């Protein structure tokens, strides 16, 4: 859920 | 008998003071300081003098394993910064290490979190409050063996168990802009519990939540999900939640209610794409409070910090019947409330995406499933 990093 | 389900509600509060200190890391979204910023507010609007503040206990290992595994809790009794190395392969197992990751105190954060849950659950089922509020609580994400979206231990699936004790049917809400997804898993095949879940859809995480998802077993329409679009605003959301949540309580009659407040929902979030302001996250309080059921209100989302502290102050006066002055208070934390030191906030030009039609069709197909409870 975090979009500045990873896929969550 | 002469009761009439009106009047002013007994409210209890969960708090630990040591909550704020704990760090998720060097630019990380979720800031447990946010659940203090939000108890320093409503301390200096003197809301302490209606409800009763308690600190809660930190729940055991032994709490935690009601739902998690043994393993699972295990390894986060164990993990810690300086310990990393070796255990490699159990972070990637249990999923911590990026979007969940390592930080001084994790496990106490844990226990603190879900200490605050499963005494509210409590205290409702002893009859001796009628709303129970803990804003460090609410970590919808949390899975049986691996923790998921800044979630590690699932407070709510915890809470929850806790009141099917002495409550045959429990309403879980959850207006967090992500899908519950933690909470629906845990009781997807079980009518004991039913998961209503209010998410923005598509492209998005946890990419869980479609609206034909609707349970299975014994629990087939049992979660109820609307999907939503960018940048709903307070007119299109107040339209479709009450009579939802109207048509759920008629067909399902629970005897206790969880409602998640997750703030990410919230115009501006960090993380979020709708466009709601307090008063319109705050309706929704409003709306399951009428309904005079034991409700357990958790926190959750929400990374705009001052808008998480604005959100769940007001909705503590709400749940109090307090009228609090738009003008904040003093605060140790005034300087994060500029420029303008407002309790309420206004929308964003954002294009509302969710069309009224598109709203209307799908709140017609959740009351299909509604019509298929006995
Ligand atoms: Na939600
Ligand atoms: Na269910
Ligand atoms: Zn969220």
Redesign the interface.
């Given at each position: 859920x975090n979009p500045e990093q990873x896929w969550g | 008998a002469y009761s009439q389900g009106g009047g002013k509600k007994k409210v209890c509060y969960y708090y630990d003071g040591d909550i704020g200190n704990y760090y998720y890391g060097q630019?990380?979204?979720m800031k447990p300081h946010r659940i203090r910023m939000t108890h320093n507010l409503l301390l200096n609007y003197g809301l302490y003098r209606k409800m009763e503040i308690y600190r809660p206990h930190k729940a055991t290992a032994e709490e935690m394993t009601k739902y998690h595994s043994d393993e699972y809790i295990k390894f986060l009794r164990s993990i810690r910064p300086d310990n990393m190395s070796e255990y490699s392969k159990q972070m990637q197992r249990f999923n911590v290490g990026?979007?969940c990751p390592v930080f001084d105190g994790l496990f106490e954060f844990c226990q603190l979190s879900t200490g605050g849950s499963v005494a509210g659950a409590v205290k409702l089922n002893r009859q001796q409050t009628d709303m129970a509020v803990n804003w460090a609580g609410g970590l919808h994400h949390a899975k049986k063996s691996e923790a998921?979206?800044?979630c590690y231990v699932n407070d709510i699936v915890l809470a929850i168990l806790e009141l099917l004790k002495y409550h045959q049917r429990v309403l879980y809400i959850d207006i967090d802009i992500?899908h519950g997804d933690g909470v629906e898993e845990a009781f997807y095949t079980t009518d004991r519990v039913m998961t209503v879940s209010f998410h923005k859809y598509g492209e998005?995480?946890?990419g869980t939540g479609d609206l034909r998802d609707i349970g299975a077993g014994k629990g087939k329409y049992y979660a109820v999900n609307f999907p939503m679009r960018d940048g709903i605003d307070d007119e299109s959301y107040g339209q479709i939640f009450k009579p939802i949540i109207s048509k759920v309580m008629e067909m399902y009659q629970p005897s206790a209610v969880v409602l998640q407040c997750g703030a990410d929902s919230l115009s501006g979030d960090r993380?979020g794409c709708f466009n709601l302001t307090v008063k319109g996250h705050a309706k929704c309080v409003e709306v399951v409070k009428t309904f005079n059921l034991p409700l357990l209100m958790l926190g959750g989302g929400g990374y705009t910090i001052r808008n998480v502290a604005r959100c769940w102050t007001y909705e503590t006066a709400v749940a109090l019947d307090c009228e609090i002055p738009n003008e904040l208070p003093y605060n140790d934390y005034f300087e994060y409330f500029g420029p303008d030191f407002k309790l309420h906030i206004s929308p964003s030009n954002m294009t509302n995406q969710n069309t009224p039609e598109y709203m209307e069709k799908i709140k017609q197909r959740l009351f299909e499933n509604l019509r298929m409870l006995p």
């Open positions: - | 630019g990380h979204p990026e979007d998921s979206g800044f992500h998005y995480f946890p993380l």
